Symmetry: C2
Subunit: 357 residues, 2 copies
């Protein structure tokens, strides 16, 4: 692959946000050259997590068929389990798919009681609802996929949505993730793909412009659902849910590493730095309350130890023209004895499906 | 890559039409056919990807170019405007910028290049020029030029792609699906046609063109308007080509009437010996490209190709005249235009033809090719 070289960028404390780069050429033997083979090497160390809930089976099928064989696939379904039992429909698709491709894949249902059991017996209750079960939501699904990914030794994790109309785009996202990591110089790296979102980008940059003093545009992937991170970085990040996930990752990262403090708490991170790559894909986005998305994204910014007295004012008046709801946040999953957690997920979960993984 | 294995198929004389196959898995090294990623990249280097274009949007052309595997040489035959404003000029700029950023091996020429029309005359091949003696405007002619250029650089396979695709990634899959079709082939004379309601009518009559002789209805043919297709140079080289919307269906009609049965086998003894294989691959990506007058100009011409086939029967004939009228595109008493057909470019001396293009064409552009 060929991409524009990473030239321009801005720094905030220990955070480096690279200017968006374009993919210049897809298949390859001011321009970065990431050989196709270095990408396939990294691919084998990247878990592609797919949190899903009632998506169209023909779309899920295409996304699955597009993920590079090399990549382990982790599916966390919070699909409807009755009248009709759709998890059941997905289980069937997954095995047919495995029978035709031998892809390495793990699938589990979010409501698996053997899953909720591992979280408690391990002390991690941040992901449970009042009925003692894992709360429905996208962040929780991502958290489960994340731990599963850690349990199999993944070094990188990429997120992909199962309702893409363009399988080829999914194939490019994964490769673009790899490309982002291969151009990184830090073990704490995030890759966010790019092709409302501007209002989120407008305020995220503003979140910063208000103490650098200079208006910026550098941030352009604030609602980037298609993103990837190294396991090291994912594991120390508190996660939100719903539409707050993407913008919140950015807000938290600046909040905690935008200045230098408690450097002792996260030594290696402050020293190695956090890099955020923003790659503009070659393919367009096509998939299938803009008001909630919009309110939750901005709520993420309005509520930080870093939003100014004035920044909040505009958001407010922008939203109105009664404050924004504080976003649900779950603690990092780093201090979870992954093995113990996995042992009891394996010995108690009734929906876990393993195929050569 | 993984594909459903070729199991079902039908034969007609020396023609083997394989049942449509689906791509089951995209990236692979490892009822199912396994064509390792690497065998595909080897073939890729011997395949010229021909892109006949005419006034397409620059940003779409740019994406298509960026998606073609670096290893594939690219041949562009532009018949774009030359003033008000000169957009061949805009394309030349895009192509150089592209070349400076990627070092892709590429050749581009304008269809109206007088140094191009000169090579065709001095070589005896007049089928492609009009009165003025210039190369006629049209997609088949563009394809013919790209085809000879491809032959001039030693391409063994040629794949056709349209420059107005909205999905770069799909173009990237087409080229790979072409290779896959060729790698599952057992004949040097192979065609690969991609697949994903005008084509259902063309497919209906194409199969009917055959069912009328076998007496058994078939649905084997499902890529009658497959713009995305590819062939071995050996096969492309001996085929008469039409133009406009008749190109794709006509390739099928001609292959069926010349090899649909043994005869004058001496004229093409090697072809009859190895047979012609037609693979039909269903892509993983959908089809989303850049009118409606066109769609039923497409209907009118696809069907005319069949109607004028020496394989047609009076029955298939009135059924076509009829379907065609019931739609309001053919008068109640006029029979469909006959198609335009130039002949195989096999007897053109490629070497002395290329010398004339190289030494006389003011629009020819080359980058490591």
């Amino acid at each position: 692959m060929l991409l524009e070289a990473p030239v321009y960028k801005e720094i905030f404390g220990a955070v480096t946000i690279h200017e968006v780069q374009k993919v210049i050429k897809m298949d390859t033997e001011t321009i970065s050259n990431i050989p196709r083979e270095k990408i396939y090497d990294l691919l084998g160390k990247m878990a592609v997590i797919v949190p899903m809930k009632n998506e169209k089976l023909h779309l899920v099928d295409g996304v699955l068929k597009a993920i590079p064989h090399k990549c382990p696939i982790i599916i966390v379904s919070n699909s409807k389990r009755e009248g009709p039992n759709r998890y059941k429909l997905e289980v069937d698709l997954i095995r047919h798919f495995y029978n035709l491709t031998h892809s390495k894949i793990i699938m589990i249902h979010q409501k698996d009681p053997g899953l909720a059991k591992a979280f408690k017996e391990v002390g991690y209750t941040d992901i449970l609802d009042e009925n003692g079960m894992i709360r429905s939501g996208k962040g929780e699904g991502m958290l489960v996929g994340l731990l599963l990914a850690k349990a199999i030794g993944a070094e990188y994790v990429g997120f992909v949505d199962a309702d893409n109309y363009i399988p080829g785009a999914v194939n490019e996202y994964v490769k673009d993730y790899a490309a982002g990591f291969l151009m990184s110089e830090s073990e704490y790296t995030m890759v966010r793909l790019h092709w409302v979102s501007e209002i989120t980008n407008h305020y995220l940059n503003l979140l910063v412009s208000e103490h650098t003093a200079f208006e910026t545009t550098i941030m352009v992937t604030g609602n980037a659902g298609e993103h990837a991170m190294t396991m090291k970085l994912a594991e120390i990040l508190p996660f939100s849910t719903g539409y707050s996930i993407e913008p919140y990752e950015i807000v938290y990262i600046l909040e905690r590493f935008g200045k230098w403090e408690n450097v002792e708490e996260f030594k290696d991170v402050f020293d190695q730095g956090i890099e955020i790559f923003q790659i503009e894909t070659l393919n367009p986005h096509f998939h299938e309350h803009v008001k909630e998305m919009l309110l939750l994204s901005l709520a993420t910014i309005y509520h930080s130890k870093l939003a100014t007295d004035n920044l909040r004012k505009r958001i407010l008046k922008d939203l109105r023209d009664e404050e924004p709801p504080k976003p649900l946040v779950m603690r990092p999953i780093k201090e979870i004895p992954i093995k113990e957690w996995m042992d009891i997920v394996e010995g108690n979960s009734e929906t876990l499906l393993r195929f050569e993984l």
